[model samples]
Target: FACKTANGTAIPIGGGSANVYVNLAPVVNVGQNLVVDLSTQIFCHNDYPETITDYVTLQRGSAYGGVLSNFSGTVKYSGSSYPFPTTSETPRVVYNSRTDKPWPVALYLTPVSSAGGVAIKAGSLIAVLILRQTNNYNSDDFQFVWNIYANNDVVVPT
Candidate 1:
């Protein structure tokens, strides 16, 4: 199964942040890989540029905690050019055979600035694409997709 964010902004998954939620029910078997595609645009409200960091988390069964993957970069929209700059990143996960359990995954994005905070202009979009495993060697394994959205978050509407 695959999942994506609405607008074009990456939504927060965990760590007590206001963002979207993705529930991966069913079960992701061993020897499978989960791929995530994401994109975000940050707008500078003041005269300076702003830095943004996006994070992703993967949680294995109820007993195990989640893992975090952080990606950071900068965006400037208040310059003379007024160019709506965009940045994108893709990450993949391969299930560990030793774990012996299924897992759930989530993604998140946040805006930051050296000055303090930055405002994202209207129309800024962030997109996410999730790809599930294909092979079923040991058993009938499957994955589920659940979309969650926040006030500023975007989860592609079906």
Candidate 2:
């Protein structure tokens, strides 16, 4: 349900709004990597009784586009017995800048084998994103937009 810094603290999203202000001062050096972790504090539920396919999309804003590059990510799950399993395929860019929405990367939480009808447990680590900083300017306002869905149902922040 949230994005976290490397230390595991959830980045507050504008106090109930959608803007997530990630402070990049500590790792502002050009060519350095910024690690952002995606996690959930609540159990995941889907509309169907079948397996859940939680989708997360992160799009770079103008500020981010000028400073970050080499967007990459990998998935992680709660546990072996849980519905979600780790995946070898990494996050990919679903849409490019040619589209009206611009470039956005997608993180998938579907299991490796498509095996369950259960909900994802609370406090699960969904994915890890590695973004390389291309410049050192404006590290204080490194911005990005996030959107998520589970089985076609939009997940609104609470």
C-alpha lDDT of all candidate models, in order: 0.23, 0.25
Error of 2 at 10 (Å): 9.6
Tell me the tens digit of each residue's lDDT in model 2 across 1-158.
Answer: 12332333333422121222232222212233333223332111112223222232221212122121222223232211211122232342222112122122323222222222222222222222332111122232222333221111111111
lDDT of 2: 0.25
Residues 1-158, candidate 1: write the lDDT tens digits: 22223332322211121223333211222222222211231111111113222222221111101111111222221111111122322232343232222223323232222112122212222222222232223232332222222223122111
Candidate 2: residue pairs that collide: 1-40
- Worst-scoring 10-residue span by lDDT in model 2: 149-158
What is the Cα-based lDDT of residue 124 in candidate 1? 26
Once fitted onto the true fold, the runs of candidate 2 whose alpha carbons sit more than 4 angstroms away are 1-103, 136-158
Q: What are the clash counts of all predictions, listed in order? A: 10, 1
Lowest summed lDDT window (length 10), candidate 1:
61-70
Q: What stretches of model 1 exceed 4 Å from their correct place?
A: 1-103, 108-110, 114-118, 121-123, 137-158
